[PDB]
Design an enzyme around this catalytic site. Structure first.
Site, PDB file in Angstrom:
ATOM      1  N   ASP A 167     -24.141  29.425 -20.399  1.00  0.00           N
ATOM      2  CA  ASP A 167     -24.632  30.031 -19.167  1.00  0.00           C
ATOM      3  C   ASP A 167     -26.144  30.167 -19.219  1.00  0.00           C
ATOM      4  O   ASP A 167     -26.765  29.876 -20.239  1.00  0.00           O
ATOM      5  CB  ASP A 167     -23.890  31.323 -18.760  1.00  0.00           C
ATOM      6  CG  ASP A 167     -24.383  32.554 -19.491  1.00  0.00           C
ATOM      7  OD1 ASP A 167     -24.479  32.527 -20.739  1.00  0.00           O
ATOM      8  OD2 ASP A 167     -24.640  33.570 -18.808  1.00  0.00           O
ATOM      9  N   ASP A 218     -19.376  28.783 -27.221  1.00  0.00           N
ATOM     10  CA  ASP A 218     -20.283  29.796 -27.699  1.00  0.00           C
ATOM     11  C   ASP A 218     -19.422  30.734 -28.523  1.00  0.00           C
ATOM     12  O   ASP A 218     -18.206  30.788 -28.317  1.00  0.00           O
ATOM     13  CB  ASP A 218     -20.883  30.566 -26.519  1.00  0.00           C
ATOM     14  CG  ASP A 218     -21.957  29.774 -25.763  1.00  0.00           C
ATOM     15  OD1 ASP A 218     -22.356  30.222 -24.657  1.00  0.00           O
ATOM     16  OD2 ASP A 218     -22.413  28.721 -26.263  1.00  0.00           O
ATOM     17  N   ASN A 253       7.040   5.528   3.089  1.00  0.00           N
ATOM     18  CA  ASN A 253       5.954   5.775   2.151  1.00  0.00           C
ATOM     19  C   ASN A 253       5.229   7.095   2.384  1.00  0.00           C
ATOM     20  O   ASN A 253       4.729   7.701   1.440  1.00  0.00           O
ATOM     21  CB  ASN A 253       4.973   4.603   2.161  1.00  0.00           C
ATOM     22  CG  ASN A 253       5.640   3.294   1.797  1.00  0.00           C
ATOM     23  OD1 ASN A 253       6.645   3.277   1.087  1.00  0.00           O
ATOM     24  ND2 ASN A 253       5.087   2.190   2.283  1.00  0.00           N
ATOM     25  N   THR A 266       9.629   9.603   3.440  1.00  0.00           N
ATOM     26  CA  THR A 266      10.853   9.358   2.673  1.00  0.00           C
ATOM     27  C   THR A 266      10.653   9.470   1.164  1.00  0.00           C
ATOM     28  O   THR A 266      11.412  10.159   0.484  1.00  0.00           O
ATOM     29  CB  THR A 266      11.471   7.989   3.003  1.00  0.00           C
ATOM     30  OG1 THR A 266      11.859   7.955   4.383  1.00  0.00           O
ATOM     31  CG2 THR A 266      12.687   7.731   2.128  1.00  0.00           C
ATOM     32  N   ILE A 282       0.833  -1.196   0.000  1.00  0.00           N
ATOM     33  CA  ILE A 282       0.000   0.000   0.000  1.00  0.00           C
ATOM     34  C   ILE A 282       0.874   1.255   0.000  1.00  0.00           C
ATOM     35  O   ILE A 282       1.741   1.408   0.862  1.00  0.00           O
ATOM     36  CB  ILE A 282      -0.921   0.038   1.238  1.00  0.00           C
ATOM     37  CG1 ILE A 282      -1.649  -1.299   1.418  1.00  0.00           C
ATOM     38  CG2 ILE A 282      -1.896   1.199   1.151  1.00  0.00           C
ATOM     39  CD1 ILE A 282      -2.394  -1.778   0.193  1.00  0.00           C
ATOM     40  N   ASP A 333     -28.698  26.207 -19.764  1.00  0.00           N
ATOM     41  CA  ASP A 333     -27.549  25.370 -20.139  1.00  0.00           C
ATOM     42  C   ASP A 333     -26.953  24.584 -18.975  1.00  0.00           C
ATOM     43  O   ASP A 333     -25.951  23.884 -19.154  1.00  0.00           O
ATOM     44  CB  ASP A 333     -26.441  26.211 -20.776  1.00  0.00           C
ATOM     45  CG  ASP A 333     -26.924  27.014 -21.952  1.00  0.00           C
ATOM     46  OD1 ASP A 333     -28.151  27.094 -22.128  1.00  0.00           O
ATOM     47  OD2 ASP A 333     -26.086  27.568 -22.695  1.00  0.00           O
ATOM     48  N   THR A 389     -20.274  34.415 -29.356  1.00  0.00           N
ATOM     49  CA  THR A 389     -20.250  35.706 -28.703  1.00  0.00           C
ATOM     50  C   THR A 389     -19.602  35.633 -27.333  1.00  0.00           C
ATOM     51  O   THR A 389     -19.929  34.760 -26.527  1.00  0.00           O
ATOM     52  CB  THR A 389     -21.655  36.253 -28.547  1.00  0.00           C
ATOM     53  OG1 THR A 389     -22.583  35.168 -28.681  1.00  0.00           O
ATOM     54  CG2 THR A 389     -21.935  37.267 -29.626  1.00  0.00           C
ATOM     55  N   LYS A 438     -36.768  47.673 -38.943  1.00  0.00           N
ATOM     56  CA  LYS A 438     -35.359  47.314 -38.881  1.00  0.00           C
ATOM     57  C   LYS A 438     -35.218  45.882 -38.419  1.00  0.00           C
ATOM     58  O   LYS A 438     -35.393  45.613 -37.239  1.00  0.00           O
ATOM     59  CB  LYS A 438     -34.656  48.180 -37.854  1.00  0.00           C
ATOM     60  CG  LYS A 438     -33.308  47.638 -37.465  1.00  0.00           C
ATOM     61  CD  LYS A 438     -32.803  48.233 -36.174  1.00  0.00           C
ATOM     62  CE  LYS A 438     -33.372  47.486 -34.987  1.00  0.00           C
ATOM     63  NZ  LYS A 438     -32.925  48.107 -33.701  1.00  0.00           N
TER      64      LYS A 438
HETATM   65  N1  LIG Z   1     -33.097  29.326 -32.339  1.00  0.00           N
HETATM   66  C1  LIG Z   1     -33.031  30.549 -32.928  1.00  0.00           C
HETATM   67  N2  LIG Z   1     -33.829  30.891 -33.969  1.00  0.00           N
HETATM   68  C2  LIG Z   1     -33.727  32.114 -34.525  1.00  0.00           C
HETATM   69  N3  LIG Z   1     -32.860  33.076 -34.121  1.00  0.00           N
HETATM   70  C3  LIG Z   1     -32.015  32.862 -33.093  1.00  0.00           C
HETATM   71  C4  LIG Z   1     -32.063  31.555 -32.443  1.00  0.00           C
HETATM   72  N4  LIG Z   1     -31.138  31.585 -31.481  1.00  0.00           N
HETATM   73  C5  LIG Z   1     -30.542  32.799 -31.498  1.00  0.00           C
HETATM   74  N5  LIG Z   1     -31.067  33.567 -32.459  1.00  0.00           N
HETATM   75  C6  LIG Z   1     -30.614  34.966 -32.751  1.00  0.00           C
HETATM   76  O1  LIG Z   1     -29.211  34.975 -33.072  1.00  0.00           O
HETATM   77  C7  LIG Z   1     -28.555  35.994 -32.313  1.00  0.00           C
HETATM   78  C8  LIG Z   1     -27.103  35.649 -32.015  1.00  0.00           C
HETATM   79  O2  LIG Z   1     -27.000  34.568 -31.085  1.00  0.00           O
HETATM   80  P1  LIG Z   1     -25.543  34.034 -30.627  1.00  0.00           P
HETATM   81  O3  LIG Z   1     -24.538  34.333 -31.715  1.00  0.00           O
HETATM   82  O4  LIG Z   1     -25.674  32.646 -30.026  1.00  0.00           O
HETATM   83  O5  LIG Z   1     -25.232  35.046 -29.453  1.00  0.00           O
HETATM   84  P2  LIG Z   1     -26.437  35.160 -28.411  1.00  0.00           P
HETATM   85  O6  LIG Z   1     -27.201  33.845 -28.517  1.00  0.00           O
HETATM   86  O7  LIG Z   1     -25.726  35.331 -27.078  1.00  0.00           O
HETATM   87  O8  LIG Z   1     -27.168  36.398 -28.899  1.00  0.00           O
HETATM   88  C9  LIG Z   1     -29.377  36.148 -31.054  1.00  0.00           C
HETATM   89  O9  LIG Z   1     -29.280  37.491 -30.598  1.00  0.00           O
HETATM   90  C10 LIG Z   1     -30.777  35.905 -31.547  1.00  0.00           C
HETATM   91  O10 LIG Z   1     -31.299  37.192 -31.939  1.00  0.00           O
HETATM   92  C1  LIG Z   2      -9.417   5.964   4.796  1.00  0.00           C
HETATM   93  C2  LIG Z   2      -9.206   6.653   3.475  1.00  0.00           C
HETATM   94  O1  LIG Z   2      -9.868   7.617   3.114  1.00  0.00           O
HETATM   95  C3  LIG Z   2      -8.120   6.122   2.600  1.00  0.00           C
HETATM   96  C4  LIG Z   2      -6.755   5.689   2.991  1.00  0.00           C
HETATM   97  O2  LIG Z   2      -6.216   5.717   4.370  1.00  0.00           O
HETATM   98  N1  LIG Z   2      -6.132   5.337   1.857  1.00  0.00           N
HETATM   99  C5  LIG Z   2      -6.806   5.352   0.543  1.00  0.00           C
HETATM  100  C6  LIG Z   2      -8.081   5.849   1.128  1.00  0.00           C
HETATM  101  O3  LIG Z   2      -9.097   6.133   0.379  1.00  0.00           O
HETATM  102  C7  LIG Z   2      -6.502   3.903   0.192  1.00  0.00           C
HETATM  103  C8  LIG Z   2      -6.739   3.611  -1.241  1.00  0.00           C
HETATM  104  C9  LIG Z   2      -7.945   3.396  -1.875  1.00  0.00           C
HETATM  105  N2  LIG Z   2      -7.585   3.165  -3.176  1.00  0.00           N
HETATM  106  C10 LIG Z   2      -6.235   3.232  -3.329  1.00  0.00           C
HETATM  107  C11 LIG Z   2      -5.369   3.080  -4.412  1.00  0.00           C
HETATM  108  C12 LIG Z   2      -3.990   3.220  -4.208  1.00  0.00           C
HETATM  109  C13 LIG Z   2      -3.464   3.506  -2.941  1.00  0.00           C
HETATM  110  C14 LIG Z   2      -4.336   3.652  -1.865  1.00  0.00           C
HETATM  111  C15 LIG Z   2      -5.683   3.515  -2.087  1.00  0.00           C
HETATM  112  C16 LIG Z   2      -3.898   3.962  -0.451  1.00  0.00           C
HETATM  113  C17 LIG Z   2      -5.007   3.760   0.608  1.00  0.00           C
HETATM  114  C18 LIG Z   2      -4.779   4.757   1.753  1.00  0.00           C
HETATM  115  C19 LIG Z   2      -4.384   4.032   3.027  1.00  0.00           C
HETATM  116  C20 LIG Z   2      -3.742   5.817   1.411  1.00  0.00           C
HETATM  117 MG   LIG Z   3     -24.101  33.234 -25.444  1.00  0.00          MG
END
Ligand SMILES: Nc1ncnc2c1ncn2[C@@H]1O[C@H](COP(=O)(O)OP(=O)(O)O)[C@@H](O)[C@H]1O
Ligand SMILES: CC(=O)C1=C(O)N2[C@H](C1=O)[C@H]1c3c[nH]c4cccc(c34)C[C@H]1C2(C)C
Ligand SMILES: [Mg+2]
EC number: 7.2.2.10
Length: 980
Positions: free
Chosen positions: A695, A343, A788, A791, A299, A699, A345, A507
């Site tokens: 984001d 993404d 182990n 050392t 170990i 997502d 933008t 527009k």
């Molecule tokens: N599924 C969709 N269908 C049509 N238009 C879309 C769609 N998704 C996004 N858009 C348009 O495309 C633009 C650019 O999107 P993108 O380049 O992904 O940046 P963001 O989505 O952050 O605006 C968006 O502002 C939106 O107006």
């Molecule tokens: C009590 C506790 O949390 C644990 C431990 O106390 N350990 C590991 C471990 O998970 C042990 C372990 C699990 N799988 C491996 C692969 C390779 C080496 C080790 C282990 C060392 C083990 C040890 C004792 C470090």
């Molecule tokens: Mg975006």
């Protein structure tokens, strides 16, 4: 009620048998709450650092080390007497270690907050309903709201459940679904039914999503769905059902554990296979010392502490490069990253959108359709730049058509600029696309307003203002994915030259707008739209967008003779396209959202790295591809037909071809968040480790699925919690760099992992000799533990600062099926292991055989008897000196083997021992401990040792050093007869 958006306002009441005036009868609130449950997310599943600790001990190896601690106890003796103070260390050192090893798998192995728990920061406490058993707006605990009951929301409120809007009492209503999306700007709502039963959320404009905030206005509505069945509640339910796989390291370390526990119990029966007076008790006890010795010999009790150190040292190292790695282990998997979907933008590009080309009609005579087209200068939102025709500055206002171009650009605009006093630079206010329009009409300056005598702040929105004087903006028609445009109603003001008609200034996106123009404006005149004209206008829009410019174009049109103010139902968004008809094309502006200076290279870096880059976007499939080339996702002229897809394209394929398209795909245009998940999934059905950005809670489900979820510094709260890494600067190259670092952290890991193991195979083969040949155990637990933990501990850690290859990014991604010990590397560590198992046994009993100051009895059948029941052929067998011969041999070879690790196949000749300045420094500190435990008297008495003589130090270096020779031979062979 599921498809509420699509049912009428009357159909929704008819479904819940409820009165908009009255509300839910207190009876209904009972039946309903029983049918649909409470308006809450399921409560946390629960955790705790006590059952988390108990979940570490069930592991196989930590069961064996604990078994050895049980035996270490059943070997000494019984209950209390007096003192031979010295003894119970071997069973107390291990149990000390185990507690301090389990614990390290927790309070520096973050296993706490989950993005699912985060979704309890956007479900509100209070919500206002109108039930029958009152008359006023009874505010109740959100948790008690139920499908059907009437609800009131007003500016500042968090929407309590999913609600089909009933009536908007205020002027308008403006929600803020940032949580879902991330796009600051509020959205207008209406009450008309969105008739499509399968409309996306963006198109559900008569709905409020539980978790969202009213950013303006005030409305009443009926609760469509609550609890887990709301849109945010359904994201929670997707992340709930996600099976989170372990890393490629944690997985092959797990099957290392199973192999190690199996080998121990294979030798503990193999020792048996090779094996006067008194009783049956000392015999039983004996075999139980070697079992425990074998336990600590295989170990690598250090491993965990070493690993963790490297990971925690890598985190701080990637944070300097802007990559915030949250989940600790993620640093190893960050190295195997096979694919990256980003993404466009804000990550690939800088979201600093600016106009830099634009055109209007010049003249139209039959087929003749000439364009009058200019270019603009300046990347920034600063009104600083100029317009040039024929590549030579012209005065923008001298062209009639350009005036309209800027009129619309200012009046059909919902954004603005602002000068920042601190940073000393302008700021966008609203939509990046629109703000660029606002900056344009400044640069243009179509009226020659005195702007050089104004100041930074006053001039930012100068010219725009002058235009907001000319026309008055009565109402406006919001953009909608549906018609892809927007328009404002405008009326004249002072002594101007407009009359008999007002104007709608439309527009939108080119295709849409233009197909709705029957007239073309050539100057201040007008002529009917014709094929040859339309074909020009499109030809250029296509050129600019799919050119090397990669511009996003907007058509600008006006409805010269608009419907009467009392003819449009302003609360019916479906009829907005009709009002935006019979338009007159005025011109087209085209803008850029520049790709990060950095990314071009970063992309190339991924080419050589063998990692695939996928770009998700919103650009149209055409311009989507055009940006791809320009950042180098595709070659400047190569094929791409089945490599880039759009939202609907991908949906039109059955699963088989969707899955297929994913290993050859590189670009997705106009996609729904719903796809990101499908794509991650598909990518895995190819054993690909996937980095995915996104984001918005939207997502979150995909950032959970992807081996590496990635959020943005500026990103939403929840989005971060969903990811394993966050780019503090939002830069795409920040991903690329982290993947390389992860590549280097794992490479160095593969090394010290084999090092610490290399010892263990030697430590065993040593105790297998001292048992198979029946000598006195050359090494005992308490010594091995020190080797182990300490050392080998410092050198192994210092092996984490090795210099990374200069071709580290020039090799394809490492597979998750790659075994850390295999092939010639198995025979290289079974030799090194079979050499230490002899060298620690040789030089030690050498004190029992060929020594000067020790009882040198050559071939004194140490195998025959350690019983001394006879004493016919003749406690020094329990001497400290011989144990000190084995221990000093190990320690020294380890430090040698540490040097043999700095590289896998490079000779110490080619790879000098003095490259890793911290490996040398560690050995130094490793030896000054080996000496410390020999002459600070308490220690050598506890370890059962005694300082070796200067003649007992040279024998070590005679039997130790030769390993560096055995090693090099293996290096230059795997180098020269195992290559091809
Ligand atoms: N599924 C969709 N269908 C049509 N238009 C879309 C769609 N998704 C996004 N858009 C348009 O495309 C633009 C650019 O999107 P993108 O380049 O992904 O940046 P963001 O989505 O952050 O605006 C968006 O502002 C939106 O107006
Ligand atoms: C009590 C506790 O949390 C644990 C431990 O106390 N350990 C590991 C471990 O998970 C042990 C372990 C699990 N799988 C491996 C692969 C390779 C080496 C080790 C282990 C060392 C083990 C040890 C004792 C470090
Ligand atoms: Mg975006």
């Amino acid at each position: 009620m599921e498809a509420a958006h699509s049912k009428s306002t009357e159909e929704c009441l008819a479904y819940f048998g409820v009165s908009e005036t009255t509300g839910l009868t207190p009876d209904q609130v009972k039946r309903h709450l029983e049918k649909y449950g409470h308006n809450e997310l399921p409560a946390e599943e629960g955790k705790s650092l006590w059952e988390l600790v108990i979940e570490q001990f069930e592991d196989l190896l930590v069961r064996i080390l604990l078994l050895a601690a049980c035996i270490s106890f059943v070997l000494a003796w019984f209950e209390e007497g007096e003192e031979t103070i010295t003894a119970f260390v071997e069973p107390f050192v291990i149990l000390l270690i185990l507690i301090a090893n389990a614990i390290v798998g927790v309070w520096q192995e973050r296993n706490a907050e989950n993005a699912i728990e985060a979704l309890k920061e956007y479900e509100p406490e209070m919500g206002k309903v109108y039930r029958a058993d009152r008359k006023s707006v009874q505010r109740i605990k959100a948790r008690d709201i139920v499908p059907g009951d009437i609800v009131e929301v007003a500016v500042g409120d968090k929407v309590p459940a999913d609600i089909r809007i009933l009536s908007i009492k205020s002027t308008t209503l403006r929600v803020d679904q940032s949580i879902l999306t991330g796009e600051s700007v509020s959205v207008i709502k209406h009450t008309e039914p969105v008739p499509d039963p399968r409309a996306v959320n963006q198109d559900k404009k008569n709905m409020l999503f539980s978790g969202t905030n009213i950013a303006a206005g005030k409305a009443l509505g009926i609760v469509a769905t609550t609890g887990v069945s709301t849109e945010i509640g359904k994201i929670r339910d997707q992340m709930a059902a996600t099976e989170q796989d372990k890393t490629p390291l944690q997985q092959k370390l797990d099957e290392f554990g199973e192999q190690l526990s199996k080998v121990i119990s294979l030798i503990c029966v193999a020792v048996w296979l090779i094996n006067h007076g008194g009783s049956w008790i000392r015999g039983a006890i004996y075999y139980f010392k070697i079992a425990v010795a074998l336990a600590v010999a295989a170990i690598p009790e250090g491993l965990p502490a070493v690993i963790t150190t490297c990971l925690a040292l890598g985190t701080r190292r990637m944070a300097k490069k802007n990559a915030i790695v949250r989940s600790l282990p993620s640093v190893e998997t960050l190295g195997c990253t096979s694919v990256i979907c980003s993404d466009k933008t804000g990550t690939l590009t800088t979201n600093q959108m600016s106009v830099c080309k634009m055109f209007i009609i010049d003249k139209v005579d039959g087929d003749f359709c000439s364009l009058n087209e200019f270019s603009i200068t300046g990347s920034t939102y600063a009104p600083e730049g100029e317009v040039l025709k024929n590549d030579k500055p012209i005065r923008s206002g001298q062209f009639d058509g350009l005036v309209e171009l800027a009129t619309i650009c200012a009046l059909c605009n919902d954004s603005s600029l602002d000068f920042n006093e601190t940073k000393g630079v302008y700021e966008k206010v609203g939509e990046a696309t629109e703000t660029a329009l606002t900056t344009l009409v400044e640069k243009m300056n179509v009226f020659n307003t005195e702007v050089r005598n104004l100041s930074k702040v006053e001039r930012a929105n100068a010219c725009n203002s002058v235009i907001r004087q000319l026309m008055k903006k009565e109402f406006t028609l919001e953009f909608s994915r549906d018609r892809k445009s927007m328009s404002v109603y405008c009326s004249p003001a002072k002594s101007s030259r407009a009359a008999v008609g007002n104007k709608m200034f439309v527009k939108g996106a080119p295709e849409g707008v233009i197909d709705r123009c029957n007239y073309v404006r050539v100057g201040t005149t007008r002529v009917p739209m014709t094929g040859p004209v339309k074909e020009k206008i499109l030809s250029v829009i296509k050129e600019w967008g799919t050119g090397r410019d990669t511009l996003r174009c907007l058509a600008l049109a006006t409805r010269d003779t608009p419907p009467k103010r009392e003819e449009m139902v302003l609360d019916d968004s479906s009829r907005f396209m009709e009002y935006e008809t019979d338009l007159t094309f005025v011109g087209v502006v085209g803008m850029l959202d520049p790709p990060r200076k950095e990314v071009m290279g970063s992309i190339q870096l991924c080419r050589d790295a063998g990692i695939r880059v996928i770009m998700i976007t919103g650009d149209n499939k055409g311009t989507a591809i055009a940006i791809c080339r320009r950042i180098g996702i595709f070659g400047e002229n190569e094929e791409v037909a089945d490599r880039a897809y759009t939202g609907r394209e991908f949906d039109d394929l059955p699963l088989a071809e969707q899955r297929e398209a994913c290993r050859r795909a590189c670009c997705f245009a106009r996609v729904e968040p719903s796809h990101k998940s499908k794509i991650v999934e598909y990518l895995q059905s190819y054993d690909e480790i996937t980095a995915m950005t996104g984001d918005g809670v939207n997502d979150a489900p995909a950032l959970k699925k992807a081996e590496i979820g990635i959020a943005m510094g500026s990103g939403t709260a929840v989005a971060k919690t969903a990811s394993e890494m966050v780019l503090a600067d939002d830069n795409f190259s920040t991903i690329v760099a982290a993947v390389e670092e992860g590549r280097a952290i794992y490479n160095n890991m593969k090394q010290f992992i084999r090092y610490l193991i290399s010892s263990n195979v030697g430590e065993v083969v040593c105790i297998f000799l001292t048992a198979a040949l029946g000598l006195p155990e050359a090494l005992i637990p308490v010594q091995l533990l020190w080797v182990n933990l300490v050392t080998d501990g410092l050198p192994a850690t210092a092996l984490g600062f090795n210099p990374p290859d200069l071709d580290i990014m020039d090799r394809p991604p490492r597979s998750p099926k790659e075994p850390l010990i295999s092939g010639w590397l198995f025979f290289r560590y079974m030799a090194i292991g079979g050499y230490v198992g002899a060298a620690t046994v040789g030089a030690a009993a050498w004190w029992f055989m060929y020594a000067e100051d020790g009882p040198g009895v050559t071939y004194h059948q140490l195998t025959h008897f350690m019983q001394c029941t006879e004493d016919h052929p003749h406690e020094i067998f329990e001497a400290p000196e011989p144990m000190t011969m084995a221990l000093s041999v190990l320690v020294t070879i380890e430090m040698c083997n540490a040097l043999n690790s700095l590289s896998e196949n490079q000779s110490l000749m080619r790879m000098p021992p003095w490259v890793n300045i911290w490996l040398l420094g560690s050995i130094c500190l490793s030896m000054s401990l080996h000496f410390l435990i020999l002459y600070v008297d308490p220690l050598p008495m506890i370890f059962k040792l005694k300082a070796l003589d200067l003649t007992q130090w040279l024998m070590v270096l005679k039997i130790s050093l030769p390993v560096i020779g055995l090693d090099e031979i293996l290096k230059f062979i795997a180098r020269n007869y195992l290559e091809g």
